[PDB]
Design a protein around this ligand. Structure first.
Ligand SMILES: O=C(N[C@H]1COC(=O)[C@@H](NC(=O)c2cccc(O)c2O)COC(=O)[C@@H](NC(=O)c2cccc(O)c2O)COC1=O)c1cccc(O)c1O
Ligand SMILES: [Fe+3]
Length: 281
């Protein structure tokens, strides 16, 4: 049993352990994917494990849907450690802590290394994590010099459509740490002023008038309004967008269930973003 430090809080956990239950932290599912960690408990999406996670969920029971942990089922698992999420309200984190030692994994994308390092420390995979991290940084380094200086000066936006609504995120959240931080594009004022995931109207978006828009849309997250995207696409206000008219809308260039603040989300978005913002004469 070892004392693990994660974001200035220490936790006492048997290390290494196979008995890890992930609930809420889709970030940790993505870290588990690249570290080849097969958790005892994993997050279900619309009741199943996505094909992209099937290699690591072969020993997993579902811990519940992302935002609806099943405390009873997690209790039944008797896990060594629970990887929860900082997005959970305190009430829910505390309910989860009755099942075992609970570490809320950060949804702040600037903590991607720390999140990976935590899972590595739990599984004794520190070397493997170091390599994944260093390969992203080399990848970023080579991709950057390829990125064209016109696109760098441009106004680009990442939006995610949930329950029919359009959301934006802070500068250090979701894919934005890669778009504005790593790639160096200028965050729009609306992103800079955002304090968390926040609703933006199509009407307001028409005023922002970005040069490029990455739209993330998961059918699982839009059960009420499954036409949310096709509805937007037929809307005269959407059709007035510079990005739309210039064919600079990129729908799901990364899987819509990707969370942004993880090694795996970063490498994917880096590649997709570089694709859309490169050229040749
Ligand atoms: O800033 C983010 N949230 C804010 C703001 O998000 C919201 O207010 C709402 N939210 C969605 O409707 C949402 C609809 C469909 C899908 C959603 O994910 C929704 O969030 C409600 O969620 C919640 O109230 C709470 N939330 C979870 O419990 C959760 C638990 C586990 C896992 C979660 O994702 C959770 O939200 C807390 O939400 C927040 O603090 C935020 C950022 C980056 C990425 C996020 O996902 C964020 O939510
Ligand atoms: Fe959320």
């Amino acid at each position: 049993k070892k004392k693990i430090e994660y974001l200035d809080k220490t936790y006492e956990v048997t290390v290494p352990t196979d008995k890890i239950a992930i609930t809420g932290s889709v970030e940790s599912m993505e870290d588990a994917k690249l570290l080849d960690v097969h958790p005892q408990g994993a997050i279900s999406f619309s009741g199943k494990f996505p094909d992209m996670f099937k290699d690591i969920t072969d020993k997993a029971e579902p811990t519940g849907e992302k935002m609806e942990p099943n405390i009873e089922k997690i209790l039944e698992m008797k896990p060594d450690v629970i990887l929860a999420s900082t997005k959970f309200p305190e009430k829910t984190l505390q309910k989860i802590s009755t099942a075992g030692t609970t570490i809320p994994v950060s949804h702040i994308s600037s903590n991607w290394k720390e999140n990976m390092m935590l899972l590595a420390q739990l599984t004794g995979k520190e070397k493997k994590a170091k390599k994944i991290i260093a390969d992203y940084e080399q990848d970023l380094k080579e991709t950057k010099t390829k990125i064209n200086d016109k696109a760098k000066d441009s106004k680009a936006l990442v939006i995610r459509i949930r329950q029919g609504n359009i959301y934006i995120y802070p500068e250090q959240v979701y894919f934005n740490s890669t778009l504005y931080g790593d790639l160096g594009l200028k965050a729009p004022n609306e992103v800079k002023a955002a304090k968390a995931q926040e609703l933006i109207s199509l009407e307001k978006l028409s005023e922002m008038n970005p040069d490029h828009i990455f739209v993330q849309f998961s059918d699982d997250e839009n059960a009420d309004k499954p036409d949310a995207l096709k509805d937007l696409e037929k809307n005269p206000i959407w059709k007035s967008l510079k990005a739309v008219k210039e064919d600079h809308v990129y729908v799901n260039s990364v899987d819509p269930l990707a969370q942004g603040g993880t090694a795996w989300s970063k490498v994917r978005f880096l590649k997709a973003a570089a694709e859309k913002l490169t050229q040749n004469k």
